[PDB]
Amino acid sequence: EGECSPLGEPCAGNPWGCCPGCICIWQLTDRCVGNC
């Protein structure tokens, strides 16, 4: 699986990050915050 999920897929790899509507932090691991 490589099509991201609502808050789930890490930001390391790209476009393996989090689906549109959320922003990445990666100041600890790769936590996405927002409303997606």
The CA distance from 36 to 13, in Å, is 20
Token output for 1? 């699986």
Helices (H), 1-36: none
Experimental method: NMR
The 8-class DSSP code of residue 20 comes to T
Written as one letter, the residue type at 11 is: C
Q: Which own/partner pairs from 7-12 qualify as long-range (CB within 8 Å, at least 24 positions apart)?
A: 7/32, 7/36, 8/32
Query: Which residues touch 11 (CB under 8 Å, ≥6 apart)?
Result: 17, 18, 24, 26, 30, 32
C-alpha 26: how far from chain center: 9
